[PDB]
Design a binder for these strands. Sequence first.
RNA 1: UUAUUGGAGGUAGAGCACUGUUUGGACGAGGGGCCGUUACCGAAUUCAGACAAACUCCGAAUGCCAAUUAAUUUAACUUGGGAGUCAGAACAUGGGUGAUAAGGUCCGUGUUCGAAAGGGAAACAGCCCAGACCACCAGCUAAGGUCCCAAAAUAUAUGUUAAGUGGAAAAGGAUGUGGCGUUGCCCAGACAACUAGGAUGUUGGCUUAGAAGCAGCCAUCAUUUAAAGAGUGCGUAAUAGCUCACUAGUCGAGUGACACUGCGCCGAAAAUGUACCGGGGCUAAACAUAUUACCGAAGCUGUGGAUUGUCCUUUG
RNA 2: CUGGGGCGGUCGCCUCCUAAAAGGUAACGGAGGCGCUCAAAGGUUCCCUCAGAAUGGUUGGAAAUCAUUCAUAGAGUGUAA
RNA 3: UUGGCACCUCGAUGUCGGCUCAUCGCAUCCUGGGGCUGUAGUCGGUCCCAAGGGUUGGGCUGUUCGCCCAUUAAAGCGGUA
RNA 4: CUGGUGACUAUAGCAAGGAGGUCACACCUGUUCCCAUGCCGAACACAGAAGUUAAGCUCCUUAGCGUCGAUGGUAGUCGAACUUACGUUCCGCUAGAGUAGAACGUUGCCAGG
Lengths: 56, 79, 136, 94
Amino acid sequence: KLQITLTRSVIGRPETQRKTVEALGLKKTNSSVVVEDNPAIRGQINKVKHLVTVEE
Amino acid sequence: VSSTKNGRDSESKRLGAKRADGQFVTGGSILYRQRGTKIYPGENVGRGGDDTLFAKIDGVVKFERKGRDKKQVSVYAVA
Amino acid sequence: MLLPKRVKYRRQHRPKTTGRSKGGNYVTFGEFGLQATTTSWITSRQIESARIAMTRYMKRGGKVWIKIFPHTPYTKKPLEVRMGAGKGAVEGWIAVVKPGRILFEVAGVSEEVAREALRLASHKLPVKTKFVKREE
Amino acid sequence: SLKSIIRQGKQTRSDLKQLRKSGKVPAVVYGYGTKNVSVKVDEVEFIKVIREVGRNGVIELGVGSKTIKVMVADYQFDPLKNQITHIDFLAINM
RNA sequence: UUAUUGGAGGUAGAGCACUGUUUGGACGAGGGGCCGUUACCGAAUUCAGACAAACUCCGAAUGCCAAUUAAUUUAACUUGGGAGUCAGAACAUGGGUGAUAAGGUCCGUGUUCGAAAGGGAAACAGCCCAGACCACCAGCUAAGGUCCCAAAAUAUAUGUUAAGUGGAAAAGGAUGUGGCGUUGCCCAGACAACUAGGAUGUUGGCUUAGAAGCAGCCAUCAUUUAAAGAGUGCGUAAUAGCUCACUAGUCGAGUGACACUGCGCCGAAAAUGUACCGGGGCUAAACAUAUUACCGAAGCUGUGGAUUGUCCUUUG
RNA sequence: CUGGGGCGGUCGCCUCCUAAAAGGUAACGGAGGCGCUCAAAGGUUCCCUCAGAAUGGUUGGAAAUCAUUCAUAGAGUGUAA
RNA sequence: UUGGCACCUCGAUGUCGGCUCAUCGCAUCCUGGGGCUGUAGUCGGUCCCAAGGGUUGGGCUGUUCGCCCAUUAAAGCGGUA
RNA sequence: CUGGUGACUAUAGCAAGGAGGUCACACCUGUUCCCAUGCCGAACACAGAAGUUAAGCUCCUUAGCGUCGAUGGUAGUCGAACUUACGUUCCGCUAGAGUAGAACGUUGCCAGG
Ligand SMILES: [Mg+2]
Ligand SMILES: [Mg+2]
Ligand SMILES: [Mg+2]
Ligand SMILES: [Mg+2]
Ligand SMILES: [Mg+2]
Ligand SMILES: [Mg+2]
Ligand SMILES: [Mg+2]
Ligand SMILES: [Mg+2]
Ligand SMILES: [Mg+2]
Ligand SMILES: [Mg+2]
Ligand SMILES: [Mg+2]
Ligand SMILES: [Mg+2]
Ligand SMILES: [Mg+2]
Ligand SMILES: [Mg+2]
Ligand SMILES: [Mg+2]
Ligand SMILES: [Mg+2]
Ligand SMILES: [Mg+2]
Ligand SMILES: [Mg+2]
Ligand SMILES: [Mg+2]
Ligand SMILES: [Mg+2]
């Protein structure tokens, strides 16, 4: 299990990064999701790691 | 005084691949638009009068090596 | 004044100037060399000025090699025209120099003479330079 | 005519940069009687050994516990910085 | 959207195998001025070294097309009713053009403005943070900040700077100052200073009107040396004269050269008024590196409320 | 159309580069072509392999035609790329 | 200055020269203070500090400029739509 | 093992040296016949078996050329932070060139030995 929190805004970020933020299930700044760890999730995180904070 | 004798170009011809390796295509689908045989017709693939490569059967596209320097595209029926 | 005897295209896009010296970064013909440390266009006229300075100081005793060559034509518009209406006419010829390229090499003189000759040369060029020896 | 090196792991760009800043030269030992090994040497010690034995001289390289007789097959150099950047050691047969 | 797998394609870089461009050599099929042998060898071959938007023996990152594909996600498409729009801007970046000019101009890519309020950037559409349903004299943060204007550190530790650098600029110039290396000499007395010497063949040869160490070319040798250049500068028309290198002595501890670097200095002149920190002021209240707090938005949270949805569900 | 307008240039079609390795992509950016030709220069069957160089050979020369060898494409592909 | 660009102004931002009135910069024309000089002196040359004040009447031309006459310690160069 | 006929990016090729000939493959002997030469029985075609391993062909040796080719490092670069610097830093990907080295083929089916 991973807790992922959107710590920075999507404003001013490329649309592809906004799309990955949406796909992770994050909605508003500081929102969070709890997801099962796997390579696909890790790839989404890695794409937007400058925008999110991950806690195991 | 000053002018350019340039300023001409023809319409772009949208060449290149039209279907992906591993994609299912129906018979007759164009697979590759080209000048000359930059790619060669493989199994169940034909080459039209203008060098266009097209599928002859329904099946899966596969781009394959042809010798050392050349390549081809073939279409194989799905089981 | 160096310039190609001919080129295929007289009007060329100006060269990229970022990055480091692709090659010719070592003294390979003489004993001493002048190494560029900053980036600039280098013109045929600057090359000729620098060559004359260093050769005159060396007093024909030693041998000089010009390692760069102004392959690239650059154009300029005629004075007082508006923008547009085609590209201008060839104005001069330049070599692009990036940090590490050896501009000149010298042999057949003492190290001190080589240093002074290449100093006099360097003051003619639009780049900073350093005195270099054959590496080993 | 001897010098010791230290084995390397898997290094990032920053790792290599910090090595070269500290003053060590990355290098690879390969050739007869050995597998490829990635090592760090000290630049000053390497320069002294090269001065002693010549460009084509034989060096006794301490690679972990083992000692290998090597020759410098090639080296990479940064002439703006006057810094040896990489070394290849060719373990010669006996 | 991501992961995995497959594929098309010739960019970045790189390279010189092709097309061109190009620097030093070597060698020379053959004839000419030459008797065989001291041009051209324009041929061919060869070594080494470079250049290319319209070169390529090579060739990424990315992006793109797909998959009886997995995870997360919430769209997607068709038909029909109604539109507006067809002057775009800055910023960043890949490029053309222009002058590696323009707040220039034309394309690619991203963001923001447009149509976006709020916080920061003194003020400042386009930068940085961030997207205001309404209410609160509640809390946490972002960018940016915490001596006073002005909310929060006159915080902690270790250094750098003396230039108000910080708070505008280049080639180039400089015993400014800090760090890390290499290295010559030195109590068999180093560096500097001071005392003494600094000589002979010889006014070296040539040249010149003259050229005598010291206009210019060629050499740059010998003798006594505790050492002394066929001379480091000044001087003469040339000499003369002073001086240095070099050596010995006095003195007694450090003294030079090179390389890579941190931070400063000069180069630096414009017009209403200080006027190139927003002000005061600052030697830290500057800069570098760590650390712990706090301030800070209409972001997020807390409480109450409105409307519209979805789901449990009569209720709520 | 137009870096005001005029004047000059341009206006349809093809190829290349710009074009940022799919496709597409602008400027009065950089270079060239087209408004045809062929009765075979089309179809098909069978057969064949170039350019250049070296060395010999008459008129024949640096290059005409002949011969051997080497020669992987530097030839040719009607006509731009 | 000659231009480049086309960002404010085309439901009007009057355009050259002169006159009147100035005002500011200093890259200083004179006057003041200095270094160097191939500065004997009297004169000069060149550079540095310095903007306090001063810095002319006429001929020609719309002219600004410019040439010329006659002076002056000097007859400065520029900004202010 | 030999041949025929396939598959495979030359790791397969080139070059050099060496070995072989009831059978086979060749060179070879001829031009009556089918067939042929812009002339030529050289070639194609056919008939045939006196001669020869000389050549082709096959096999063996090697690393001179060509081919293949790491690891390590470097260039470039997606993304991020800082920046306006012909930039810096961090992460992932990661060449070309070159080095070590590989390599004088590996194989399917069929007929003979
Ligand atoms: Mg095209
Ligand atoms: Mg056709
Ligand atoms: Mg390139
Ligand atoms: Mg613009
Ligand atoms: Mg515009
Ligand atoms: Mg844009
Ligand atoms: Mg706003
Ligand atoms: Mg404000
Ligand atoms: Mg707080
Ligand atoms: Mg306060
Ligand atoms: Mg608030
Ligand atoms: Mg809110
Ligand atoms: Mg204009
Ligand atoms: Mg692309
Ligand atoms: Mg494309
Ligand atoms: Mg044809
Ligand atoms: Mg009005
Ligand atoms: Mg002044
Ligand atoms: Mg009158
Ligand atoms: Mg490689």
